[PDB]
Design a protein around this ligand. Structure first.
Ligand SMILES: [Zn+2]
Lengths: 101, 53, 216, 65, 92
RNA sequence: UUGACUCAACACGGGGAAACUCACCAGGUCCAGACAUAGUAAGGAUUGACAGAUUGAGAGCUCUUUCUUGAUUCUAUGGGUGGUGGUGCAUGGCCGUUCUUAGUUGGUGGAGUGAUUUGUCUGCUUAAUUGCGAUAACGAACGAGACCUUAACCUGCUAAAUAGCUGGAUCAGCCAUUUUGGCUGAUCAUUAGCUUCUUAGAGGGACUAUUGGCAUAAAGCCAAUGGAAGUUUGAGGCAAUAACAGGUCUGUGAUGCCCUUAGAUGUUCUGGGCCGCACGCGCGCUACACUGACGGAGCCAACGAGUUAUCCUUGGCCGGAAGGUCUGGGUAAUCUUGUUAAACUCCGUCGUGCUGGGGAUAGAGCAUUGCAAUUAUUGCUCUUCAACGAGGAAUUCCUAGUAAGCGCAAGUCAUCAGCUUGCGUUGAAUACGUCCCUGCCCUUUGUACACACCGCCC
């Protein structure tokens, strides 16, 4: 009736994995259909620019990369447990969002 | 309150620029960056544009 | 108000870069050690590290109120939504972003450039750094301009091993003469690195364990 | 050109002089012991060290070095 | 240009109450975000008091910033109303 | 408006330009000359506005003219002050070449009065000062190597109704069918469990193992089975050292110096423009035909992007797909999108003739983007529909999914790709050689050169 979907979008692999491990461990501490992590395709943004501030010089083009990683988690937790786990899952560099309905 | 002084615009140049730039040449609006190429080069690492390859 | 992730991350990066720049221009003599910028609802907190912590803390929190109000008014923040936590320093002599500022301020004080460069080089080596490099670019005495390097210890001029624990700070310092380019390169200690604990060149093996030859 | 480097040469020299009696000529086994003893950063360097080590083993078995 | 006295008094009392204004580097702005009088008047008042001193400017990404001290509030409060005004610059 | 002078200029200053970017020229406002003082004034220092007028005008800049707030200003000094005014021979940051390769800096010792030299190499080998070896050298460091990204080969190690597979409420189409059905599937959050195929956290795997041969039977080299992998597994990134009197003061509230500042080298509105030509030089494009063109039809990919007020687009309907119509999917591997592409192929014509190959070039209307498209944005319906009939001397790139050809995505954009950066498809011949032409490194040697042969000198 009340399914909680939370986002696990970030760029730091280590910290997003740590957040994902923490919530999965809590979801295994209290049985909530033990739904595990789900991995989404990486959204990588490729931009190519020049290096020379002026126009003089050889044709050199620098390509930069910007990739983000998304994960989704579905839980059957009650409101009190949901607010508790979100309180303990405060980490830097991790953006989370919960959709109710 | 000034007439014939600053013409309002909605499209083209004179509508978008950067906070400390706006030369309108060699500037990208990709992903809503709205910054010059030189400024992007200077602060690419801070934003997250790391030369992986 | 909700924005796509591709635009959100790049906008946060631009916002963080703007805050980092704003902190650098506003903070001059307080020994800027860096800024850990993180934004989140329920009283967002941002870490500000500056060497002169006593100068950072104000009388009845006046400086804290000034900086928070200025950021709040600039970025249309609501009341009691943004807060700043002040820290003095971590690895003061190994922190290039503040040691370089101490270098240029001592240079601005009028001390001899070479003697001052030796003094800071002594300061960083005793701080726990295994290698340092001070580069001066521009002109000092006459119209002729020379670039002088004072590398002492070690240096790395390569890829990942020279971008993980290698701290490079470059500043433009004004003077009576033309503008000078100061560059300080410092080794961050090997344990204090992003993810690598040991350099690939450095490698050790286990002890040659042995026992009795017969094993009766 | 498959010329090894001084780091591989020294690393191979130290492991053989430290674990000669229990070393095995088999490539899989000597790669195993190299992994368990060394703190090698990368698998490619570990494999090159193991390959040079086992070549030294065949060289010693053919004649003293 | 003109900078009406009532407008300048309102800006001065607002500055004495808070201390920091947005002060965007803009020309012919639609009034002011902080209910602070139409543009081309407050910026000229700010430059005039900056030249007089006690209120220094700082430029960051095209946004003028100001900060005031004990002499600044005291002089502003004397100009605005009688001595020993209520709102300090050292709240709490 | 300009700068940039073969490698370091000719699709570059990410340069596809109507106003804005525009720094150029003509018409014409605003002072944004802050600050204070010598100083009237306060029977107006002075700003704005209604009527008619000059001026594109609604310029009250102002003029005949009145009315208000009336104490902040100015007749002037100096000085902050803006400057896309100049200096890259003053420089900072960065970038491009030397250098897509292979050296550089010390110390302690030995030689020389000294400048200096060894260490930094007889030999062999590598892309490598990479390594073995002798070695008046020893011990070091930087660089290379090493390190990181990407690309496939594979693991049931916690996975997934934002994606596929099967069962199953859920029904349609006939040759067979009442045990006789195969198949496409329709809905799939109505429901369940799995990731072979989608994704990423960790990883495994190759190290020339393995024998068969050369090399002083070391360092090293060649061929072959297995395997995915042998070129350092491939392709890239960061890259010591010093050299350019190289570029950028028109990216930069980064700035020293010269000059200007009110009749402003300051801000701003309009028109003309950077695209204006009897030419010389470039980088790319079109055909010079049947291998093509036209016309129907079967259809086979990847990387990337998108609305908080205001972008990517679906569906029914009207149309001259050039537009507009209304409910509408999308804050996103849920919607565009499965970007059913192009190339190709089945069939008919053009029959070999600068013709239906090729669309330089001229004219008439049809729409969106943009105060609005003249000096036609852009495409569209057409007609006129030419040179060219594989291009001399010279010159440029290229060693395997390589050139070549084709298409697609993004950048700049209000609109406009013939440019640039990436992707994928079709897919060859030529070598595994050399210093002969053309250059780069090392050693010996000669020198009257040392801004170093674009030298010195008679
Ligand atoms: Zn710029």
């Amino acid at each position: 009736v009340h399914r909680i979907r939370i986002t696990l979008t970030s760029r730091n692999v280590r910290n997003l994995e740590k957040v994902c491990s923490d919530l999965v461990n809590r979801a295994k501490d209290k049985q909530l259909r033990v739904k595990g992590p789900v991995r989404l395709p990486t959204k990588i943004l490729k931009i190519t620019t020049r290096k020379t501030p002026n126009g003089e010089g050889s044709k050199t083009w620098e390509t930069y990369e910007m990739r983000i990683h998304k994960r989704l988690i579905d839980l059957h937790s009650p409101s009190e447990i949901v607010k508790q786990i979100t309180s303990i899952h405060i980490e830097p560099g991790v953006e989370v969002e919960v959709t109710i309905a | 309150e000034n007439v014939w002084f600053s013409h309002p615009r909605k499209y083209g140049k004179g509508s978008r620029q950067c906070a400390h730039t706006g030369r309108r040449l060699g500037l990208i609006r990709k992903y809503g960056l709205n910054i010059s190429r030189q400024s992007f080069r200077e602060y690419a690492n801070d934003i997250g544009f790391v030369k992986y390859r | 108000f909700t924005i796509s992730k591709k635009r959100k991350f790049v906008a946060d990066g631009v916002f963080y870069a703007e805050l980092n720049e704003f902190f650098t221009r506003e903070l001059s003599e307080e020994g800027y050690s860096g800024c850990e910028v993180r934004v989140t609802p329920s009283r967002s907190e941002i870490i500000i590290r500056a060497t002169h912590t006593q100068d950072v803390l104000g009388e009845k929190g006046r400086r804290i109120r000034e900086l928070t109000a200025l950021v709040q008014k600039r970025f249309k923040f609501a009341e009691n939504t943004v807060e700043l936590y002040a820290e003095k320093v971590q690895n003061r002599g190994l922190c290039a972003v503040a040691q370089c500022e101490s270098l240029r301020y001592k240079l601005l004080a009028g001390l001899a450039v070479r003697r001052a460069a030796y003094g800071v080089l002594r300061y960083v080596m005793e701080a726990g750094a295994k290698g340092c490099e001070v580069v001066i670019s521009g002109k000092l005495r006459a119209a002729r301009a020379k670039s002088m390097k004072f590398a002492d210890g070690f240096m790395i001029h390569s890829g990942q091993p020279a971008v993980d624990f290698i701290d490079s700070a470059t500043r433009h310092v004004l003077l009576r003469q033309g503008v000078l380019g100061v560059k300080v390169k410092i080794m961050l200690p090997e344990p204090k690195t992003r993810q690598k604990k040991s350099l690939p060149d450095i490698v050790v093996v286990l002890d040659p364990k042995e026992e009795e030859p017969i094993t009766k | 050109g498959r010329v090894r480097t001084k780091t591989t040469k020294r690393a191979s020299r130290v492991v053989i002089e430290k674990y000669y009696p229990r070393l095995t000529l088999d490539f899989q086994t000597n790669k195993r012991i190299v992994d368990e003893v060394a703190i090698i950063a990368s698998k490619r360097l570990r494999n090159k060290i193991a390959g040079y080590t086992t070549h030294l083993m065949k060289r010693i078995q053919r004649g003293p070095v | 240009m003109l900078i009406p006295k009532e407008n300048r008094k309102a800006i001065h009392q607002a500055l004495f109450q808070q201390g920091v204004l947005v002060a965007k580097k803009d020309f012919n702005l639609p009034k002011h975000p902080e209910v602070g009088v139409p543009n081309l008047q407050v910026i000229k008042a700010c430059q005039s008091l900056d030249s007089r001193g006690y209120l220094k400017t700082r430029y960051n990404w095209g946004w003028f910033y100001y900060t005031l001290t004990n002499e600044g509030v005291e002089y502003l409060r004397e100009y605005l109303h009688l001595p020993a005004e209520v709102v300090p610059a050292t709240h709490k």
